[PDB]
Amino acid sequence: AADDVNPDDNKEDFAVLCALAALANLQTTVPSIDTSGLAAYDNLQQLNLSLSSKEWKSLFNPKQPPEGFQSDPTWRKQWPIWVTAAAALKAENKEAAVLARAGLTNAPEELRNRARLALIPLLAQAEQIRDRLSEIQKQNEDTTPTAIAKALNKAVYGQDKETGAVYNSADCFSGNVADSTQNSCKAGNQASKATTVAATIVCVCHKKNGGNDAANACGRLINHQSDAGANLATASSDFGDIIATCAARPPKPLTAAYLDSALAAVSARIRFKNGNGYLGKFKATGCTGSASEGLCVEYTALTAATMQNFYKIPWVKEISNVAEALKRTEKDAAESTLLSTWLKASENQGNSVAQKLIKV
Ligand SMILES: *[C@@H]1O[C@H](CO)[C@@H](O[C@@H]2O[C@H](CO)[C@@H](O[C@@H]3O[C@H](CO[C@H]4O[C@H](CO)[C@@H](O)[C@H](O)[C@@H]4O)[C@@H](O)[C@H](O[C@H]4O[C@H](CO)[C@@H](O)[C@H](O)[C@@H]4O[C@H]4O[C@H](CO)[C@@H](O)[C@H](O)[C@@H]4O)[C@@H]3O)[C@H](O)[C@H]2NC(C)=O)[C@H](O)[C@H]1NC(C)=O
Ligand SMILES: *[C@H]1O[C@H](CO)[C@@H](O)[C@H](O)[C@H]1O
Ligand SMILES: *[C@H]1O[C@H](CO)[C@@H](O)[C@H](O)[C@H]1O
């Protein structure tokens, strides 16, 4: 009976599935967009405004530019930035602190004017940097620990929640379990069912009731204290025994590379026979939990040339979406470090122009 499903026959599949299951209820840090440069740019805006004429300052003390400028593209772009700067300078002692940092406390009118003009090229250089940093901030704002946890809890348990996700067949199998194990343990088909990591573990590892089971296929250390019932009717109790043996922890912070390597590893283990793909040992008839048949997920009609469809199965899609988001955020976080360092440097440069202008 070496060709039947025996204890340990799905042990190596189970190690990969354990790694994936450990993405449930995850508490990870995400790469941070370093937005300290936005504050540095806002300080430069405040200096520029403080040094401006009374006629210019009068424009801010409105939701839109004044008559004549409501259609000027530069005024439309800058209005909120200017308004924020004006608002921040209303705060007690703020303008005095801004001028002091710039060397401009009690500055003569001519020096205030020459200093403001000296900021023109500096601000023009910094604008493009600040706008890229603001774009990065916006583009990555949905890449958060909470959004990742929810997506991964959909992947593992079919539950769109940040924490407290647990095995429930109503969620782990699409529409709950099917009339038969064979139909429940199919994915990608018209009647796709095994659409989460947890359902995949049930199908690859469960002990069916009624004899002729493949208990301990996923490892001899599982203590199957019950069974999954007939046709997975009571899978939850058995799943709890299986998952109790899994200790996996992903690297922290979670990376795109780690998720991509996990999906690649599964892709490398799926085997094609007679027009379907299989994860877990398949002998004949279907993925039924019976030892002489199979303990597996049947990727119905999956072939090497249609493998793109594996990436559309819910759990795979959710993990893929997390990986893609992380892939962008990792790069944009590293970019933002330098954008923010550059903008802080521009702030320091702005605070130095008065010394040059005093000396001539
Ligand atoms: C730092 O703080 C200063 C203020 O101290 C602030 O300066 C102001 O910047 C704005 C935005 O660039 C300047 O707006 C221009 O205003 C002129 C008209 O100027 C008169 O009216 C204003 C408001 O009453 C007075 O402040 C000023 O002293 C003058 O009395 C407009 O003609 C400009 O429009 C052209 O440029 C825009 C910028 O790209 C275009 O969007 C627009 O379409 C216009 O360009 C077209 O027409 C041009 C003329 O024919 C042509 O040459 C172009 O190719 C194009 O075809 C613009 O609205 C304002 O004057 C500044 N005020 C002062 C006193 O300097 C800085 O903005 C602030 N720095 C930062 C980085 O925020
Ligand atoms: C697993 O159970 C099925 C259904 O009873 C049986 O057909 C196989 O022979 C057994 O190994
Ligand atoms: C299922 O059928 C195989 C032979 O095909 C047998 O070895 C198993 O014991 C039985 O359950």
Side-chain angles (χ1 to χ4, degrees), residues 1-31 33-53 55-60 62 65-66 68-69 71-75 77-89 91-92 94-108 111-137 139-188 191-251 253-307 309-323 325-327 329-341 343-354 356-359:
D3 61 318
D4 298 316
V5 188
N6 297 288
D8 286 334
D9 276 353
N10 291 340
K11 165 177 177 181
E12 296 299 322
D13 295 337
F14 183 66
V16 175
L17 294 170
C18 174
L20 294 162
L23 302 173
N25 301 304
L26 191 68
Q27 300 186 358
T28 190
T29 56
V30 171
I33 298 314
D34 179 346
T35 59
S36 68
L38 299 180
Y41 185 76
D42 288 321
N43 294 343
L44 280 166
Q45 281 284 336
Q46 291 171 54
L47 179 60
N48 187 60
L49 177 57
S50 172
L51 296 174
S52 295
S53 67
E55 290 81 8
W56 183 256
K57 287 169 169 183
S58 84
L59 300 175
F60 309 102
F69 295 93
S71 293
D72 184 304
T74 293
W75 287 61
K77 170 174 191 302
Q78 299 288 70
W79 199 256
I81 297 166
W82 292 340
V83 166
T84 298
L89 274 184
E92 188 169 2
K94 184 65 179 298
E95 184 164 13
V98 167
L99 293 168
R101 292 193 299 263
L104 285 162
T105 300
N106 298 331
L111 175 62
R112 286 167 50 79
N113 180 67
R114 283 188 300 137
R116 197 185 69 259
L117 300 178
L119 299 178
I120 288 172
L122 181 160
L123 289 162
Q125 192 283 326
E127 178 190 23
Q128 291 253 332
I129 306 310
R130 181 259 176 216
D131 289 349
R132 175 59 183 169
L133 181 56
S134 180
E135 172 176 64
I136 279 169
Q137 183 189 40
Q139 283 176 357
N140 293 278
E141 71 183 358
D142 294 329
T143 307
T144 69
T146 298
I148 288 179
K150 291 180 155 206
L152 296 176
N153 274 335
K154 289 179 65 182
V156 179
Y157 283 130
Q159 298 188 335
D160 189 13
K161 65 189 182 184
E162 179 185 21
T163 196
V166 298
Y167 184 90
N168 180 337
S169 290
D171 300 312
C172 287
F173 287 84
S174 186
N176 218 316
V177 296
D179 55 348
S180 64
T181 303
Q182 185 164 356
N183 289 334
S184 291
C185 294
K186 292 173 181 181
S192 194
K193 300 299 293 196
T195 52
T196 63
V197 179
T200 305
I201 291 171
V202 169
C203 287
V204 168
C205 304
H206 76 278
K207 178 179 182 170
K208 73 176 196 76
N209 95 335
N212 307 304
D213 60 77
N216 293 99
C218 288
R220 287 177 191 274
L221 286 77
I222 301 165
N223 292 338
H224 293 270
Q225 303 184 87
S226 57
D227 56 46
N231 295 302
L232 307 181
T234 66
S236 176
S237 66
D238 196 53
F239 179 85
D241 288 325
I242 294 155
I243 206 68
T245 68
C246 176
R249 284 300 179 273
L254 184 69
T255 65
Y258 178 79
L259 294 178
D260 278 346
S261 167
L263 294 186
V266 170
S267 80
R269 297 190 71 80
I270 290 172
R271 296 281 168 267
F272 297 120
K273 185 173 174 174
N274 299 344
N276 303 314
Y278 297 90
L279 185 64
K281 188 161 179 173
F282 171 72
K283 172 169 165 167
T285 297
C287 298
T288 64
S290 165
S292 299
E293 296 179 343
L295 194 67
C296 46
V297 173
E298 176 194 309
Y299 298 95
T300 309
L302 193 68
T303 64
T306 59
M307 203 42 196
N309 289 336
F310 176 74
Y311 298 83
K312 292 174 189 162
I313 296 174
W315 66 269
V316 186
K317 176 61 166 187
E318 293 291 343
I319 293 176
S320 297
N321 284 350
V322 173
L326 285 176
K327 210 172 279 187
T329 307
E330 288 161 6
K331 295 190 226 163
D332 291 356
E335 182 182 355
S336 76
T337 299
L338 291 152
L339 302 174
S340 281
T341 291
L343 285 163
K344 288 178 278 197
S346 292
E347 184 186 9
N348 201 233
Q349 186 183 343
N351 284 335
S352 80
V353 300
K356 172 183 172 196
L357 290 168
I358 288 169
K359 295 183 180 103

